[PDB]
UniProtKB/Swiss-Prot annotation, chain A:
One of its GO terms (molecular function) is protein homodimerization activity. Residues 496-511 are annotated as: Interacts with the transport core domain. The chain holds residues 76 to 1194 of 1325 of the full protein. This is Sperm-specific sodium:proton exchanger. A motif (Essential for sodium:proton exchange) lies at residues 162-163. It comes from Strongylocentrotus purpuratus (Purple sea urchin). Keywords: Antiport, Cell membrane, Cell projection, Cilium, Fertilization, Flagellum, Ion transport, Membrane, Signal, Sodium, Sodium transport, Transmembrane, Transmembrane helix, Transport. The chain crosses the membrane at residues 2-21, 27-44, 61-77, 88-113, 120-145, 149-174, 186-217, 222-244, 248-261, 269-302, 308-337, 344-371, 376-406, 544-566, 567-590. Residues 45-60, 114-119, 175-185, 245-247, 303-307, 372-375 are extracellular. GO terms for cellular component: plasma membrane; sperm flagellum; sperm head.
Amino acid sequence: KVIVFISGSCLFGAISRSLFKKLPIPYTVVLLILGAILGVVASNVPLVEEHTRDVAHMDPHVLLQIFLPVLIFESAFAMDVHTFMRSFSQVCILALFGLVVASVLTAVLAMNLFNYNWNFSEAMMFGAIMSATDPVAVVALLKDLGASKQLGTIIEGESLLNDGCAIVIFNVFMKMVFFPQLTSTVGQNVLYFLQVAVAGPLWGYAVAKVTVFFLSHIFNDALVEITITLAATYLTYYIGDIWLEVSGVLAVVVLGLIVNAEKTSISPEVEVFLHRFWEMLAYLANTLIFMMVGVVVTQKALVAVDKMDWFYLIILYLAITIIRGMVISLFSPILSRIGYGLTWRNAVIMTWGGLRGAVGLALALVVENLAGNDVIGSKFLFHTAGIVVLTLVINATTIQTLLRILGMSDISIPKRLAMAGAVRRIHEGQNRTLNMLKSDRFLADADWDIATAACEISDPYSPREFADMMEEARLRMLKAEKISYWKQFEHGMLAREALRLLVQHAEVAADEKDQFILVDDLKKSWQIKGIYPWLKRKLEDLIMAFEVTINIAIVLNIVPIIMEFVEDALRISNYVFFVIYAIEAIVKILGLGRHYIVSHWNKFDAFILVVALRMLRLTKALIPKLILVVNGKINNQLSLGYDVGKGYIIGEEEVGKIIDRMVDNKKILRELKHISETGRLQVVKELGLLQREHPGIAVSVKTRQAIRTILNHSRETIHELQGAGLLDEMEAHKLELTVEIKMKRLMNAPSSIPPPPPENLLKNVSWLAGDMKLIDFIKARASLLHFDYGEVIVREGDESDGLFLIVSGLVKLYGKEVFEDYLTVGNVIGEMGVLTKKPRNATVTCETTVQVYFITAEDMNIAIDTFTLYPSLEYRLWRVVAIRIATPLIMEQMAFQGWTQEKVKLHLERGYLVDLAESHFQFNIDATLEDVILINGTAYNAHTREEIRSPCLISRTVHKLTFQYTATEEPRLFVVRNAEY
Amino acid sequence: KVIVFISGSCLFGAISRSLFKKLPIPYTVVLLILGAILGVVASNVPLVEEHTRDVAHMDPHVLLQIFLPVLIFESAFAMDVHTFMRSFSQVCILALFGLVVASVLTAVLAMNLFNYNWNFSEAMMFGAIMSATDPVAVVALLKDLGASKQLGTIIEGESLLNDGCAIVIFNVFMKMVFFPQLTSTVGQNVLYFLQVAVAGPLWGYAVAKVTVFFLSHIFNDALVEITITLAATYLTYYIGDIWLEVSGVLAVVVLGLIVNAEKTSISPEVEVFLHRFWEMLAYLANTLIFMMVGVVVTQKALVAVDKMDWFYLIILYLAITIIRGMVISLFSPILSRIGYGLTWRNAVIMTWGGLRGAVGLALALVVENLAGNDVIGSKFLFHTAGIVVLTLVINATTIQTLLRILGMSDISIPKRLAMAGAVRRIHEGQNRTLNMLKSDRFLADADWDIATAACEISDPYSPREFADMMEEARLRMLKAEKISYWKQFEHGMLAREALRLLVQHAEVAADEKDQFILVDDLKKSWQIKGIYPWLKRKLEDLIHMAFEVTINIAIVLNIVPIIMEFVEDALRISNYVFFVIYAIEAIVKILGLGRHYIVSHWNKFDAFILVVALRMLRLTKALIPKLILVVNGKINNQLSLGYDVGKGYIIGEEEVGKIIDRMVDNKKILRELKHISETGRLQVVKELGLLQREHPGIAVSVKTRQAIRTILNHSRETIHELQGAGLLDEMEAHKLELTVEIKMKRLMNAPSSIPPPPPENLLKNVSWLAGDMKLIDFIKARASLLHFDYGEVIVREGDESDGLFLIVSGLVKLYGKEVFEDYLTVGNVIGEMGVLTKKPRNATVTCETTVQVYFITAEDMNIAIDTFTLYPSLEYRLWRVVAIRIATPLIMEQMAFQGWTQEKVKLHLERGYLVDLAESHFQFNIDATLEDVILINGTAYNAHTREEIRSPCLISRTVHKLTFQYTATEEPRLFVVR
Ligand SMILES: Nc1ncnc2c1ncn2[C@@H]1O[C@@H]2COP(=O)(O)O[C@H]2[C@H]1O
Ligand SMILES: Nc1ncnc2c1ncn2[C@@H]1O[C@@H]2COP(=O)(O)O[C@H]2[C@H]1O
């Protein structure tokens, strides 16, 4: 019956796809040709005639209900959603206007020239059936050799919208023509138009949001989400099919776009499985419909032969080609003026990009089968088969020729240079490892000709002098900046979108002109000036159990509206609404203790309750949702702008220190350094102004990039640990799943701005001995002094003024060999100036804006006199300065070799100070104390009578020590007991 | 009509699967419970009654033709094929015997005790319907917490074979019971049995091989192979369904097993897509059939209430449980004796491993629907629903309790120690990178509490003294050997199977007893003593070519009308065509009769068949080379694997022997451990050497197949490092890495057939640059092929010069004098300066392995020198070789040639010549045209500074003119490179 035909069709499609892969002509036309052969065999042998008659004469219902929604759903599934949304406005405008112009022009051309006794509706149906297209072949060719990304997305989106509008027009006009028993008045026609406009896509959006919310609560389960997605898609299609014969495909398209847009709630395995499954179904449908078209056209059009239609076909193709070119040629200056400009290469490649696919053949089969025994169906089928089999080869050959000639698919010089360098590096490394392997003991009598020929690799590709030198120098500088950007991305310091924005900004201004870097485009990239801030300014300035119950009651009030739009239950529903109003009155009575005297907005709700249509109650809960989503929407773009600004700054800083060695001409080097430093200084001030506008964006981006850097380095560490054999494959995978989970949780990070860190709470918590004395010191010291870049607070050798503790920022200390230290938030500086009364010994500078608290010598004396009986703050300060002095001289010792900063920090935390007054300035060293450090003073050995002074390390050989008490130098020691105690 | 029921069924299955994931009870019983609820709603409301009446009363044809083949196909698709084949024999024996014993015991128990007026066929049907089971739940539980691999495969294979034989028996009896109008004589019954035996699986094998051969010619295309595989599976099922009512499932199972077995011709993406698609279909079918069973049993069994059946159910469950235990308990000693032994833990976990699934419920629905208005269908459905809903909870709880109690799912000490060490290392690295990141300029006012809490990680888990010390020392040594094996695998020096074999050999002898390493098990691992060599020995010793291939194809075509013979004018024309083919064969034989007219032993039978005029003998002689080549490949793979694992053990022991000494400090333990390790190494090296001696191609194959792996791994690491430095972007890196993946894929199907040994004369002529007739004369005057084994020194430093030696097989190590160590491979020339400079010796060369060398004496060297005198091109080439050998090491170490590798300085100095001192009268002028000037030999006097220098030395660029003094004992020699 039908089995052998389908199996043979699949085998023929497979062999045709495998054979004609190399030729630029798409495979599908071969299928059509093969179908033609079957026709001239179906007229003689009764067996193939029986098989074809059983299969090729199916009902239109199955075609119109199955073959088209699958194809349009596939055309609306494989597209990149974000790239589509980047140009949705121009794509929609161009697609709609091209569709309407092409349809009306084809209709009037047919009526004027064909000399057929047709009506206007037949010609409009002809135009609609000649308007639809399919871009899978041209986008496949572009993927193969076009070397472009945005062009295919533009073509796919335009084709999708064109197909949707074309099938809408064809369905309405076919229903008007072939069923001449329906009223065509305006009152229901406008209702039908608005229904198809608004009711369908909103229903698809609602079901998509519902199923996404359902899938959000599913963890590490793969079958459930696949089955739920398939069932939801079929349910949407079935409700659309019950509703109309048109809006179902629109609802399916919207649902597919929304599902493809979301990525956080669906694991990638499900997405790739769904892509593969839907692609397989679409390919099968396309092959079957092509073979059916071929066999039916060969069996039918042999009795409709004339020279007039053969003359008509060529001029029809010429007319549709010229109008398709002319509409976009006329609309190009408007697009250039509005800002969505496109190059003339894009226009000339768009002119030939219209390839007819399978939608037109489907509609032709439907309109031929519904025509009965009439010549109109044969004319339709023959003309559409002729035009598709003409364009499918001619347009493909011409687009390949134009893509070759225009040279946009040309490998640039840096691409070839980088590929050659990479190939040379790989070959050198392989030669080195071969040389190492040849020296191995067990690698003897291995034929090295086979080994060398097996692993060989190769690339797939194979004042004028001053101006040329400047041009090549700036090209090399652009190359260095690009590789710096890629290095920064690979180390993890950047996000994804900022990286591609920087790369494309560098590329579009690389070889266009002499200027290479611009700042105002970056300015508009990070700042927001569109309609969103104006909408926010208008919106936010012009305007739980009880709320949930009120919302549920308002939703329940739609059921009387449903009945009204369509009894005892309805009266009971009105009584329930009155009871809900009474419950609202009871809620007001309960809130009378808070506020019930008068209200402004609630008068409308009171009037609505007096009427009892309760949709006005839900807008109070709807108000926070709009601000909640728009604040995140603007903050995401603001964070991306700050990120790309920081990336440009750090890239310029990295490339600044290498340009001097690259060139040797003085004038070029000077002018390049001048323009680079002016650009950096111009952008850094605006970045600082953006930071000063609000501080939460910087905090968010720093705390969202530190996690990325830490996770990347942990992944590198675990890969290295796997490479050393200390753990096997399964444990490594089990541990790496945790890293993947951490990254997945980081993906949906709270991009909403975290509150700024507290001032008093962090002051009390960060210091160990937080008490009421700290509060008294804060009340006696409120400076919050701010120092910007390029300022030095104190200098070495200057007289001591007091103690300074930092509350915001990072500072760098240079002291004396020499050392460099970095103090973060919560550090205390100026310590020995109040204890040992030393003027100064080191210089501290600030690399950014810092907020600090100032304590003077008088303030320090007042603080010291504030607590005297139990100076816990003073004792903690003594411990802090003691461990600060003792820390750097222990890790460098040979005894503590192989110890990190945290190891020596946590080793010495369990140590105290020695009371020299109780011990009468005499100490005995035993094995109980693990470490003894001379903090201050001069110590005299009780055995060797040797005098030593701080900074020094007491050896384990010394057992008894004596100290001399002096007012100007009081001896101090730190003792850490053994870890076994 | 049917849509809402299916949609609600899928939603209920989804919510039940999501909710009951944590509890050890499988989700499916909840579905059954939910179905029960629908029943007590279907009896009152006419709407749900209409929906249930429409969907749940489905005809048996769709169930019996759709629901069962999908389930059995899924049970025969997700299995690991190789692990199944490792124990196929014991799995088949145990499954078949357990099935037949359980079926007959259930039948006789039902007939004796149930007091129902049933026949023997009804009880056999009852046993067949109670024998089937499903492995999905138990294997899922074992994947979750069983911590085992082989047990799940054993259970799955047993369940698959049991299901296939059970459905065969059920069909062959149900076709007799409910259709009492068919003859049951032996003559057709034995034909049916042999038909199911041989016709089905062979047809599945043929279609699988045909579609694999079809898919082998498809490159980088994904849709075509998926569509072809699906169409081939349906075509196999349809031909099986037309053929018999039960052969289709067997053919589909065989086709699925063969498709899953193959891996080279199918890309992994297609395989995982097919796995996911088939699993989705099976899950949907299982959920739907469970809900159907629940609703039908609640609607039906409410009018079949008694205490007799409610008492019979418990004793039936007890009887089937005890017989299932007892059959394998009785068969365990036979398995232990035969060598396929299993531990008592495996037996006690296999006893409770029988969980009834969906096949029995499918057969119950079929038999209940075909029973009509009779009590037998209700009894069948109620009893099977009761037993499945009892076992599905009770057996799951008991198997979880037993798995906890028996302690086989316990984390060992080394696992916890390694996990803790890895966690500590990761935390230390993260702390270090956080400390580095805190000092960055642009990382200011970032709340570090959130950063620390976000990236925190943790593990999922949380003379007696002398003997204890020895035990912990040998455990630590085993851990060191295991990590050495993993390091060797990760560096790329091992294959996959040898790695897992060595790891499991280390594991099974780790904590069992005091001994740790055995050698005779490795001996039987690398050597072959099975039935394969004996069958090869008896087989291969007991037994215009294109036109012959065309004649064989025609003889194959002659078999096509034989189907008509088994089944007119066309048949007579077929006989005439066969006679014409016979005449053509006779003409071909007469043409070949000039070379050989007498018929051979097989040719006499061929002539007899031609007189008969069959092609079976021609096909057999065509497939004789096929069986020869597949036997050769099968034996060579095992030999290569054994040699690989032997080499891996040797290099692992060599690595661990250097580090074992530092680990322990007790003298006696260290001495005895070194003694046993060295005795094992010395025992295994001699056997490996003789194994390599017996046939040398295996070693050549394994070396040339592992060098490519090492080179490709290091190239991949280099490309990853280059990507990490930003010199190329993502797309170019992926495009380049595709080439590495293609190289690895081509290496996967490597020519494991043994390459021929390298030639002797051809390599001697080609490897040397100046190969000519003089080399042939030297070979005729020097044929030594001396073989030196390990531990032998050929010459020593200071001994008198004897001649020149050129190495033809092996690698040697030279120690000379600072001091230097050199490695000479095949094709090197040694002992060259001893005849040129008349020097005795200056360095000592030894051999690290067996070496085959050619010996040339001083008299032979003099004869060779006197052989070519007019144009001694061999002598000129030797002078160039010794000149470049002397000049090479002293240039790369110079500051001028800094950053130059060995190949760079080798290819830089190849465009160099010698200076003729006779033509220049021993005076040379150095200009900028010559890039490098090297004093090879002699004393050079500067013409300006009057300074005397001698080789080895480097002439600086400041020196312009030089003079040389000619001496017989020291002739000056120089080399100049442009
Ligand atoms: N080794 C050190 N590490 C960190 N900070 C130091 C070190 N030595 C001195 N300082 C700080 O530098 C300050 C310089 O002036 P003061 O002596 O007032 O107090 C000193 C300490 O706060
Ligand atoms: N630098 C070197 N590198 C490699 N081989 C050498 C080197 N120097 C000497 N030889 C070889 O060692 C041999 C020792 O004895 P002969 O002098 O007969 O010939 C010598 C050369 O073949």
